[PDB]
Scaffold this active site. Structure first.
Site, PDB file in Angstrom:
ATOM      1  N   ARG A   1       0.006   0.559  -1.083  1.00  0.00           N
ATOM      2  CA  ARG A   1      -1.423  -0.010  -0.365  1.00  0.00           C
ATOM      3  C   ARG A   1      -0.952  -1.047   0.800  1.00  0.00           C
ATOM      4  O   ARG A   1       0.167  -1.465   1.617  1.00  0.00           O
ATOM      5  CB  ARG A   1      -2.514  -0.480  -1.406  1.00  0.00           C
TER       6      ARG A   1
ATOM      7  N   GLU B   1       7.564  -7.422  -0.848  1.00  0.00           N
ATOM      8  CA  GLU B   1       7.429  -8.509  -0.056  1.00  0.00           C
ATOM      9  C   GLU B   1       8.631  -9.833  -0.824  1.00  0.00           C
ATOM     10  O   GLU B   1       8.697  -9.038  -2.201  1.00  0.00           O
ATOM     11  CB  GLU B   1       6.184  -9.205  -1.041  1.00  0.00           C
TER      12      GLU B   1
END
Ligand SMILES: Nc1ncnc2c1ncn2[C@@H]1O[C@H](COP(=O)(O)OP(=O)(O)O)[C@@H](O)[C@H]1O
Ligand SMILES: Nc1ncnc2c1ncn2[C@@H]1O[C@H](COP(=O)(O)OP(=O)(O)O)[C@@H](O)[C@H]1O
Ligand SMILES: COC(=O)CCCC[C@@H]1SC[C@H]2[C@@H]1NC(=O)N2C(=O)OC
Ligand SMILES: COC(=O)CCCC[C@@H]1SC[C@H]2[C@@H]1NC(=O)N2C(=O)OC
Lengths: 422, 422
Positions: free
Chosen positions: B268, B252
């Protein structure tokens, strides 16, 4: 001054499909419906609704003057006939354009041409679309039959010269061609526009059938190479131009020992169009609407590349063993989802399937990078699907998908009926 | 001797998503569930079920020993943690591999590394993944702050030197970095395997948020060119190898005036993974499972080409105005469909949404050849969607999708909250 409002001259899932394309293009919709269909999903979503008659088809969806008045009273630009009902009715098409509306499909003249068998063959034969060897039109039939070669189809099927003259006379109170014994059904999707373009959108195999009605369809067709696709596809694109085709259409072939033999052009969108969408990325109903509006097809032939594999199961409200219809209230519908799963259906929890029309209630479409993935996704989506209150043919689909010969691929048009006998 | 049975250590939609991938690969499933979740779709479909505790999260889905015993008692090979709950819990991962099961995700060591901020920056910074300028760790802070340049984030945000020492002490009974004022959230999807490969799967823009929680996500991100994608993507693939990453993951960034600034690696699968699926044709949950089994990633980087555009609306059982949860019985669910519409949800007509967990009930995902088509498909699918008996945030989604600045694209992370204030 373009297409701004479209009468959807159909019902059920294809009416919803059309509504969806219209709404994507910002096109206003007019849902014409019978009294039994006021609770159809697409009627409920439509901008305007007009009841065109009582439940029976004859009095509603086949009511040419009521459908034309509905276009008149709403100020519509065009009429989309879907498939079935009036979609291949030249008189309807002729009357629609004579009243100044756009008919979303080919011109009436072309519907009649491809709507009669001898005429359609002539025209294909001249375009260089391969046809089944035959007499071409119309004693000397012992010899015509001779050279075509037995077995022969007058349409009876005819295996003996002895009994030619009989089967000649027998069908003749009720033309000749090679009977292909174990062909597959392989069809080519096309689009043609008013700018002189025409394209082919690979092919579908719809060989799994019962009583000539399709159950499962797939795309591309197993065994067909890109080379072969290009050849046959480009002959169909060319045929389109020769006949001044317009709109979406399909060239259906019987395909046997490596060769294509033309049997019909459906001059309309087909039930099974979604599988071609999934493998090409083309929105075929949008292109219908664009083309009807006078636009060019939105891509060129070299933009089309077959990617992955797709399957469609026609889910019908019918007993899976006797195939008798099963109308009534769907108490719950749980529809499948997830990656590679598409669900095209006007059914919802609470909805009553009427007796009056066909029994198709949903099309379940899966996509995968390989045929095996698409079949597995189909199997898993079917096991998740619940339609509670009526019977469906889901159990039939599950048996087909687990069939070893189906998994190998390339089963012929008689396979399902044989399987079902065994 | 491979992965044959997988415990799905999660619930709700992602548990169903995982179940679907398992069943596509022929992998047996074990649904571990709380007493309140016996009627979850994926529990009902699962091959084996084990109740791991009473309704509260603490006692069920976060019950590390009950989840490990469930793997033990069933003879399972691996555990898939989904997202949320234990998925980024290193102690859980450590304990899973110490009991000899495969944890479907990275190794415990890597979870801790990317699970703590200073440590994660170090490691990115060394990999050449761009980070936000800061002090790097840890009087002289007037000057550190000096050169980083105001405004500053201790985490307070800090606009004046006057009040540095204060906001230093204020957060310090409760590191420094450039505060980016109006960035977007742009994240890069990766996969890395045990064969030394790692790939990037373009990016998602998840800037539309409320209270830091994402509402709408899209892929690719508007404005990002292929050149730029390649640069940042390949830095993330490389970072993956440097840290011995394994499995699916996301880098991110805060993205502002043309530059990427790293803020977290989610180690994940993410909620919003479907939009990347739609634009790349990759099955990200399947690849998780393959990779966990010791397989290579099933494609190479040059096989990945961004095609079209995708959007996702997180549909929540909550009041669309106050955002208070709305648990209770869904009397009818009518889910949308048609071309380019994907629906990822464990909800069905008859199902009761419990109070005990998050309020996400469905993800509605659309795809189109352009961003405008995907937004229009989203608008039309939302208008068809009926969820009767509880309140949802569908009205919020409709307002977002009709927002002119959203349609232009590229709105920043504060836009939704501003919009909502105005
Ligand atoms: N040359 C042929 N060899 C074998 N079967 C044929 C041949 N021509 C027609 N048939 C059979 O008869 C069917 C009838 O044609 P079709 O286009 O389905 O009629 P309709 O469209 O009016 O139902 C064909 O699919 C095919 O199965
Ligand atoms: N350098 C920065 N500039 C502006 N905002 C930031 C910066 N760093 C963090 N934030 C804000 O704080 C949020 C918290 O980070 P996040 O990874 O969401 O925490 P968590 O994942 O635990 O919820 C970020 O999305 C961002 O909006
Ligand atoms: C609800 O009723 C309708 O919307 C029309 C019913 C279906 C018409 C039939 S199904 C198989 C055949 C016809 N249309 C079509 O496309 N078919 C197709 O496969 O081409 C032959
Ligand atoms: C039913 O409960 C669950 O299956 C877990 C609930 C969701 C966890 C949150 S939602 C936004 C965030 C977390 N997981 C995730 O992927 N998010 C994502 O966008 O990455 C931040």
């Amino acid at each position: 001054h373009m297409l701004e409002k479209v009468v959807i001259a159909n019902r059920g899932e294809i009416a919803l499909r059309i509504l969806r394309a219209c709404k994507e293009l910002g096109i206003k919709t007019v849902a014409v419906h019978s009294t039994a269909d006021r609770d159809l999903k697409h009627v409920l979503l439509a901008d305007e609704t007009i009841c065109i008659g009582p439940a029976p088809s004859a009095k509603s969806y086949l009511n040419i003057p009521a459908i034309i008045a509905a276009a008149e009273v709403t100020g519509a630009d065009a009429i989309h006939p879907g498939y079935g009902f009036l979609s291949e009715n030249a008189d309807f098409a002729e009357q629609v354009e004579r009243s100044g509306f756009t008919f979303i499909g080919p011109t009436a003249d072309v519907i009649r041409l491809m709507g009669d068998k001898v005429s359609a063959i002539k025209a294909m034969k001249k375009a260089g679309v391969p046809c089944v060897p035959g007499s071409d039109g119309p004693a000397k039939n012992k010899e015509i039959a001779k050279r075509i070669g037995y077995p022969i189809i007058i349409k009876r099927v005819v295996r003996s010269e002895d009994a030619l003259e009989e089967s000649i006379a027998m069908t003749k109170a009720e033309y000749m061609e090679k009977y292909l014994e174990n062909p597959r059904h392989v069809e080519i999707q096309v689009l043609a526009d008013t700018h002189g373009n025409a394209v082919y959108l690979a092919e579908r195999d719809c060989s799994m059938q019962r009583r000539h009605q399709k159950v499962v369809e797939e795309a591309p067709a197993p065994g067909i190479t890109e080379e072969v696709r290009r050849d046959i596809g480009s002959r169909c694109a060319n045929a389109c131009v020769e006949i001044g085709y317009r709109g979406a259409g399909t060239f259906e072939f019987l395909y046997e020992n490596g060769e294509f033999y033309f049997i019909e052009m459906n001059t309309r969108i087909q039930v099974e169009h979604p599988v071609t969408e999934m493998i090409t990325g083309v929105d075929l109903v949008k292109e219908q609407l664009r083309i009807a509006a006078g636009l060019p097809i939105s891509f060129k032939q070299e933009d089309i590349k077959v990617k992955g594999h797709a399957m469609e199961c026609r889910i019908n409200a019918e007993d899976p063993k006797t195939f008798l219809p099963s109308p009534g209230k769907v108490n719950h519908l749980h529809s499948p989802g997830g990656l590679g799963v598409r669900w095209d259906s006007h059914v919802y929890g609470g909805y009553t399937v009427p007796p009056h029309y066909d029994s198709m209630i949903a099309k379940l479409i899966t996509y995968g990078d390989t045929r095996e993935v698409a079949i597995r996704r189909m199997q898993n989506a079917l096991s998740e699907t619940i339609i509670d209150g009526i019977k469906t043919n889901i159990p039939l689909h599950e048996l087909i998908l687990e069939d070893e010969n189906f998994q190998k691929g390339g089963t012929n048009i008689h396979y399902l009926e044989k399987k079902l006998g065994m």
